[PDB]
Design an enzyme around this catalytic site. Structure first.
Site, mmCIF file in Angstrom:
data_model
loop_
_atom_site.group_PDB
_atom_site.id
_atom_site.type_symbol
_atom_site.label_atom_id
_atom_site.label_comp_id
_atom_site.label_asym_id
_atom_site.label_seq_id
_atom_site.Cartn_x
_atom_site.Cartn_y
_atom_site.Cartn_z
ATOM 1 N N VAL A 1 21.686 1.082 11.965
ATOM 2 C CA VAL A 1 22.789 0.158 11.782
ATOM 3 C C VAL A 1 23.735 0.461 10.621
ATOM 4 C CG1 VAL A 1 21.504 -1.690 12.882
ATOM 5 C CG2 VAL A 1 21.555 -1.581 10.382
ATOM 6 N N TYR B 1 13.417 -10.148 -6.355
ATOM 7 C CA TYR B 1 14.105 -10.120 -5.069
ATOM 8 C C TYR B 1 15.577 -9.754 -5.283
ATOM 9 C CZ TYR B 1 14.752 -11.241 -0.144
ATOM 10 O OH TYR B 1 14.968 -11.227 1.208
ATOM 11 N N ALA C 1 17.343 -2.545 0.786
ATOM 12 C CA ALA C 1 18.029 -2.304 -0.477
ATOM 13 C C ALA C 1 17.301 -1.149 -1.140
ATOM 14 C CB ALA C 1 17.992 -3.563 -1.384
ATOM 15 N N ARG D 1 2.546 -10.475 4.712
ATOM 16 C CA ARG D 1 2.277 -9.074 4.278
ATOM 17 C C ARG D 1 2.622 -7.937 5.281
ATOM 18 N NH1 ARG D 1 -2.076 -5.132 1.502
ATOM 19 N NH2 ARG D 1 -3.868 -6.288 2.324
ATOM 20 N N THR D 2 3.909 -7.564 5.323
ATOM 21 C CA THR D 2 4.472 -6.533 6.222
ATOM 22 C C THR D 2 4.695 -5.178 5.533
ATOM 23 O OG1 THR D 2 6.822 -6.957 5.749
ATOM 24 C CG2 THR D 2 5.754 -8.361 7.421
ATOM 25 N N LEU D 3 5.146 -4.171 6.287
ATOM 26 C CA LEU D 3 5.548 -2.874 5.705
ATOM 27 C C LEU D 3 6.670 -2.919 4.627
ATOM 28 C CD1 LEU D 3 5.654 0.304 5.484
ATOM 29 C CD2 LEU D 3 3.726 -0.557 6.863
ATOM 30 N N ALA D 4 7.753 -3.660 4.877
ATOM 31 C CA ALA D 4 8.840 -3.900 3.903
ATOM 32 C C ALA D 4 8.493 -4.697 2.634
ATOM 33 C CB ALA D 4 10.029 -4.562 4.598
ATOM 34 N N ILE E 1 7.407 -8.606 11.356
ATOM 35 C CA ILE E 1 7.854 -9.820 12.007
ATOM 36 C C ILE E 1 8.375 -9.564 13.443
ATOM 37 C CG2 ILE E 1 9.551 -11.632 11.907
ATOM 38 C CD1 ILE E 1 9.152 -11.657 8.852
ATOM 39 N N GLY F 1 13.923 -3.558 14.680
ATOM 40 C CA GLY F 1 13.078 -3.676 13.478
ATOM 41 C C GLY F 1 11.556 -3.676 13.622
ATOM 42 N N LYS G 1 20.926 -11.898 1.639
ATOM 43 C CA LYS G 1 20.441 -12.928 2.593
ATOM 44 C C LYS G 1 21.356 -14.172 2.590
ATOM 45 C CE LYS G 1 16.641 -11.029 4.169
ATOM 46 N NZ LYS G 1 16.571 -10.555 5.556
HETATM 47 N N1 LIG Z 1 7.632 -10.060 5.577
HETATM 48 C C1 LIG Z 1 8.077 -11.131 4.882
HETATM 49 O O1 LIG Z 1 7.393 -11.689 4.049
HETATM 50 C C2 LIG Z 1 9.482 -11.616 5.132
HETATM 51 C C3 LIG Z 1 9.828 -12.931 4.827
HETATM 52 C C4 LIG Z 1 11.093 -13.415 5.127
HETATM 53 C C5 LIG Z 1 12.023 -12.581 5.710
HETATM 54 N N2 LIG Z 1 11.703 -11.305 6.001
HETATM 55 C C6 LIG Z 1 12.745 -10.486 6.745
HETATM 56 O O2 LIG Z 1 12.322 -10.266 8.032
HETATM 57 C C7 LIG Z 1 12.899 -9.028 8.518
HETATM 58 C C8 LIG Z 1 11.809 -8.086 8.989
HETATM 59 O O3 LIG Z 1 11.093 -7.558 7.862
HETATM 60 P P1 LIG Z 1 9.536 -7.186 7.961
HETATM 61 O O4 LIG Z 1 8.824 -7.730 6.789
HETATM 62 O O5 LIG Z 1 9.134 -7.490 9.350
HETATM 63 O O6 LIG Z 1 9.520 -5.607 7.771
HETATM 64 P P2 LIG Z 1 9.332 -4.228 8.411
HETATM 65 O O7 LIG Z 1 9.282 -3.348 7.205
HETATM 66 O O8 LIG Z 1 8.239 -4.260 9.415
HETATM 67 O O9 LIG Z 1 10.774 -4.249 9.124
HETATM 68 C C9 LIG Z 1 12.001 -3.797 8.499
HETATM 69 C C10 LIG Z 1 12.683 -3.006 9.593
HETATM 70 O O10 LIG Z 1 14.089 -2.785 9.332
HETATM 71 C C11 LIG Z 1 14.380 -1.477 9.785
HETATM 72 N N3 LIG Z 1 15.625 -0.992 9.202
HETATM 73 C C12 LIG Z 1 15.910 -0.753 7.882
HETATM 74 N N4 LIG Z 1 17.017 -0.076 7.690
HETATM 75 C C13 LIG Z 1 17.518 0.102 8.971
HETATM 76 C C14 LIG Z 1 18.660 0.771 9.460
HETATM 77 N N5 LIG Z 1 19.530 1.426 8.679
HETATM 78 N N6 LIG Z 1 18.857 0.770 10.796
HETATM 79 C C15 LIG Z 1 17.983 0.131 11.583
HETATM 80 N N7 LIG Z 1 16.870 -0.524 11.240
HETATM 81 C C16 LIG Z 1 16.685 -0.484 9.910
HETATM 82 C C17 LIG Z 1 13.144 -0.660 9.423
HETATM 83 O O11 LIG Z 1 13.131 0.577 10.136
HETATM 84 C C18 LIG Z 1 12.057 -1.639 9.881
HETATM 85 O O12 LIG Z 1 11.855 -1.596 11.288
HETATM 86 C C19 LIG Z 1 13.775 -8.523 7.368
HETATM 87 O O13 LIG Z 1 15.113 -9.010 7.480
HETATM 88 C C20 LIG Z 1 13.068 -9.100 6.142
HETATM 89 O O14 LIG Z 1 13.976 -9.303 5.068
HETATM 90 C C21 LIG Z 1 10.440 -10.792 5.694
HETATM 91 N N1 LIG Z 2 13.302 -5.749 5.900
HETATM 92 C C1 LIG Z 2 13.119 -5.711 4.772
HETATM 93 C C2 LIG Z 2 12.925 -5.693 3.344
HETATM 94 C C3 LIG Z 2 13.477 -4.662 2.590
HETATM 95 C C4 LIG Z 2 13.469 -4.762 1.214
HETATM 96 BR BR1 LIG Z 2 13.939 -3.228 0.182
HETATM 97 C C5 LIG Z 2 12.989 -5.891 0.570
HETATM 98 C C6 LIG Z 2 12.413 -6.902 1.316
HETATM 99 C C7 LIG Z 2 12.353 -6.801 2.694
HETATM 100 O O1 LIG Z 2 11.761 -7.786 3.459
HETATM 101 C C8 LIG Z 2 11.136 -8.824 2.796
HETATM 102 C C9 LIG Z 2 9.764 -8.814 2.561
HETATM 103 C C10 LIG Z 2 9.147 -9.927 2.020
HETATM 104 C C11 LIG Z 2 9.908 -11.036 1.712
HETATM 105 CL CL1 LIG Z 2 9.141 -12.408 0.965
HETATM 106 C C12 LIG Z 2 11.273 -11.064 1.925
HETATM 107 C C13 LIG Z 2 11.896 -9.962 2.486
HETATM 108 O O2 LIG Z 2 13.216 -10.057 2.818
#
Ligand SMILES: NC(=O)c1ccc[n+]([C@@H]2O[C@H](COP(=O)([O-])OP(=O)(O)OC[C@H]3O[C@@H](n4cnc5c(N)ncnc54)[C@H](O)[C@@H]3O)[C@@H](O)[C@H]2O)c1
Ligand SMILES: N#Cc1cc(Br)ccc1Oc1ccc(Cl)cc1O
Ligand SMILES: NC(=O)c1ccc[n+]([C@@H]2O[C@H](COP(=O)([O-])OP(=O)(O)OC[C@H]3O[C@@H](n4cnc5c(N)ncnc54)[C@H](O)[C@@H]3O)[C@@H](O)[C@H]2O)c1
Ligand SMILES: NC(=O)c1ccc[n+]([C@@H]2O[C@H](COP(=O)([O-])OP(=O)(O)OC[C@H]3O[C@@H](n4cnc5c(N)ncnc54)[C@H](O)[C@@H]3O)[C@@H](O)[C@H]2O)c1
Ligand SMILES: NC(=O)c1ccc[n+]([C@@H]2O[C@H](COP(=O)([O-])OP(=O)(O)OC[C@H]3O[C@@H](n4cnc5c(N)ncnc54)[C@H](O)[C@@H]3O)[C@@H](O)[C@H]2O)c1
Ligand SMILES: N#Cc1cc(Br)ccc1Oc1ccc(Cl)cc1O
Ligand SMILES: N#Cc1cc(Br)ccc1Oc1ccc(Cl)cc1O
Ligand SMILES: N#Cc1cc(Br)ccc1Oc1ccc(Cl)cc1O
Lengths: 249, 249, 238, 238
Positions: free
Chosen positions: B64, B155, B94, B192-195, B19, B12, B162
């Protein structure tokens, strides 16, 4: 190690089996400077002797039943550590008659009062008395038990006190966070300590890791929670019980 | 550091804001040997370039959604790491139409299916495929969010996924513990990430530490949970959200 | 009774031992007008007999794996109840191979998918399909189990599916609350020396609690998973 | 109604706005025979008027800070109800200085002690004092609040006291379940745009849920904290 440059007070060291003992060797291994309290004169030499091993000579009387004792203790501590980075609260008590048999029969008003005062109030009492001595980045830690969340036979009113204590953790976290202090608990699984003979009939086959946790496991998690590595975690009860609470049958 | 002698796979990593990126620099700072996966050809160079910084040259395609892709990926990994000490699962998805507005209107059967498959099933799918490669002492880690436990607007079905994921953490913990593997989650606060552009309208004033957590905070807790320091903790969701969830008003 | 005035759809009757069957009796006793669905041709006659015994002749096919089956059912229901007061979702499924032994070894992608689709998605699917039909004051109910919250051996992926279902309850309560609809779940015990009440729960006990949660008596309760398990989940090492 | 046959003691009526007052009306409606306590001479006439309006003339002094006051009350009750079916504990107190501003600064040892004694210990004290008087099928109820589970500003030590109270519920349900007694709590919302039902709960809503939890309808439920807060606690950032 990951607590270098931190100063941490540790309460509740009673023998080498104490949870507080495991937390102290672990923070010590990780580069903390330590100070120790002892309840009363019966434990002064012992605690000085455990302190000495860990290269502390800061060993102070503190009975948490007494506001004057906590205040005096922090006054004495301020002569050597005018500022420090938090404390470990590892202290529980209920009179023996409270933990024998049916809960509603064993519990009394006085037993309830003492259990809550010593096991729960003392944590925030310590926080009140040292609040101005804490550095930004400080961390406070207490110990709880599954009996806060589930009805466990014989644990009785201590379960109520630990529930009060975990709520104390949240209220303290919320109050002190803005000045840069975190507050957490470890809900520890059962270990064979001095205080556990007080409990009647004192599971590893239905724990997911298939063994009971040790004061080393608890100590390592403790060290973590009082370090800057856990800077994102406050107001949390972390279960260090090998996954026991999340299993059923 | 406290992960010396460990080998950890990290999924990821998408940019320096991920993250997974913070967790990787932290485990790397702590002496782990790292390996990396990337979803597809669009991210191959990028992830090789992030890997290279952290002194890994082990960078493997893994989508995956596909059993064959996970199986192939672990086959390729076994050529260099026939045994290793766990993985970080940092992957959510999603379709975009799922997270716009009223939940009951936006949710569809297909949207539900994809959200759960990618965000929850993939974690245990990875575990199935590498189970025989794990050393005793191994640790698996996923990322969750408060949306598992509370109804958070927009969400939407990700909250269901989750919740499925945190239950996955418990079932995996309970199953794998007897062979010496722990499984946990970090419920991370918002960063503040890409997702997170995928989420609409994306609180620090009512968080107890009065700031949002960073990928550094999350990374340090992650490193801890995949290390032997957390040997007493399995099947647990640790909130690394600055105490946000335990506060009200 | 405390449901007179209410029209409630009941899914998931398969036998006189079904939770849905205890729920329906209790709701009938308290004066509700009832309508029923049946999954397939194998269960139709059992559901019609039971519906007749309760004074109902609304008995509609519904297989919740199919969006068309859910839409057609609610279009048929509309012909006799253009408006109604909510429904009881009492449906669970995973392929039998999912429930056998170590979780990680038994779970598969397809098994996971089917368990979540039938046991969790179908609750909201029903809600989307009937939303404009719900009166203000309506109440949706579903049935869950402690395996949502703990790892219970062999219950395996049905636990993830229940955790998903309990989140669906919250998300649904939040979305539909402003239009006057409540959504809750019962976490039922299995239908004994470590259960505080010293007996297992019955489908009567479940039925009475379900009638309450679908009545205006529970107007203050939404998004909630109520444990009807005799105290089992709050006790340890009894 | 669904409480006909039951004799229930109600504490904590202080005014027509009291939660206990909504509980009593709802229980009277559903056919319960009621008895009341009053804390002191200031509230006696209000409680007697309200009890008269409900057809009761059992109105007994009880200050739960005093073991003797609790024993004397239950000895007086015994003269007219040698057996009964449980009671509603609707009592909370902390000194006003405890509720003002930052938690750590406001809490004191005495304030903590009084809050826990009145708001939590008194629930079990009542139970010890009447235990042999409880029929099989009895139900004890108490009232809690979300400050047991979250840090809410100014609610301060009353939150610890509620967390203690919610554990008391579990411990009591476990101890008394084998003799046929259930123990539960309602976590009531405060009596609005982020509440799923889009309104605050009323003492009617609380009353109806309390009547349920004290009736044989809830026979499957013990040791449980039921949230009657309109969904408030399950929502975030609405
Ligand atoms: N950023 C936040 O605020 C936040 C808060 C809580 C939880 N999360 C969770 O933390 C995790 C990381 O998210 P992030 O914000 O670092 O985002 P990100 O956008 O940097 O990471 C999401 C990653 O998942 C990968 N992914 C998606 N579909 C896939 C697939 N089919 N096969 C393989 N990899 C796949 C994407 O290529 C990317 O590397 C996620 O589970 C997200 O829900 C994020
Ligand atoms: N990974 C991922 C991701 C994909 C979707 Br579509 C929606 C949210 C995602 O990550 C998050 C980003 C921010 C927060 Cl607060 C929660 C998340 O689970
Ligand atoms: N050992 C276990 O299995 C276990 C499990 C979970 C939680 N805990 C908790 O961990 C903590 C440590 O317990 P332990 O098992 O290490 O026991 P221990 O008997 O070694 O420690 C208890 C300590 O509390 C001190 N204490 C009691 N009353 C005091 C007072 N008035 N003033 C100051 N100190 C006082 C005692 O002097 C002693 O040092 C306690 O809060 C206990 O409830 C223990
Ligand atoms: N029995 C227990 O001990 C217990 C305990 C807790 C929860 N539960 C839950 O209670 C609910 C009812 O279970 P039960 O014990 O009454 O079992 P049951 O088998 O009597 O009922 C299950 C029902 O689900 C229906 N169903 C399955 N797939 C369906 C589909 N595609 N479309 C429509 N209907 C479908 C079946 O027709 C059947 O009527 C389930 O959600 C189950 O998970 C059961
Ligand atoms: N009002 C709300 O919004 C709300 C929400 C959640 C929970 N609660 C809880 O509901 C319960 C009832 O509160 P309320 O709002 O009806 O308030 P209220 O002031 O009307 O009732 C409080 C009652 O407690 C009694 N009491 C106090 N000390 C006592 C003592 N020593 N002995 C006997 N009785 C004593 C008073 O006489 C009074 O009747 C309390 O436990 C309160 O914590 C209130
Ligand atoms: N400290 C302490 C202590 C005092 C009494 Br009395 C009872 C138990 C105590 O510690 C525990 C020992 C063992 C367990 Cl499992 C839990 C505890 O809280
Ligand atoms: N309905 C249903 C159902 C289907 C499968 Br496959 C597994 C369990 C199911 O119902 C339960 C029966 C018993 C218990 Cl304890 C819980 C349940 O969810
Ligand atoms: N009874 C009572 C009570 C006493 C104090 Br002091 C503080 C609050 C009390 O009742 C509540 C009123 C309102 C709410 Cl939201 C919760 C309560 O517990």
């Amino acid at each position: 190690g990951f607590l270098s440059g931190k100063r941490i007070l540790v309460t509740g060291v009673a023998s080498k089996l104490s949870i507080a003992y495991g937390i102290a060797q672990a923070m010590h291994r990780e580069g903390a400077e330590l100070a120790f309290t002892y309840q009363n004169d019966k434990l002064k030499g012992r605690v000085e002797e455990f302190a000495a091993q860990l290269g502390s000579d800061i060993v102070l009387q503190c009975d948490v039943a007494e506001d004057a004792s906590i205040d005096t203790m922090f006054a004495e501590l301020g002569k050597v550590w005018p500022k420090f980075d938090g404390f470990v609260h590892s202290i529980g008590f209920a009179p023996g008659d409270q933990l024998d048999g049916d809960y509603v029969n064993a519990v009394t008003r006085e037993g309830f009062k003492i259990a809550h005062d010593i096991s729960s109030y003392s944590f925030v009492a310590m926080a009140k008395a040292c609040r101005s001595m804490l550095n930004p980045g400080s961390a406070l830690l207490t110990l709880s038990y599954l009996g806060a969340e589930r009805a466990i036979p014989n644990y009785n009113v201590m379960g109520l006190a630990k529930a009060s204590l975990e709520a104390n953790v949240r209220y303290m976290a919320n109050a002190m966070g803005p000045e840069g202090v975190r507050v957490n608990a470890i809900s520890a699984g059962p270990i064979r300590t001095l205080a556990a003979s007080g409990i009647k009939d004192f599971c590893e086959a239905v724990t997911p890791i298939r063994r009971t946790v040790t004061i080393e496991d608890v100590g390592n998690s403790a060290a973590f929670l009082c370090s800057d590595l856990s800077a994102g975690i406050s107001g949390e009860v972390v279960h260090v019980d090998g996954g026991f609470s999340i299993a059923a049958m």
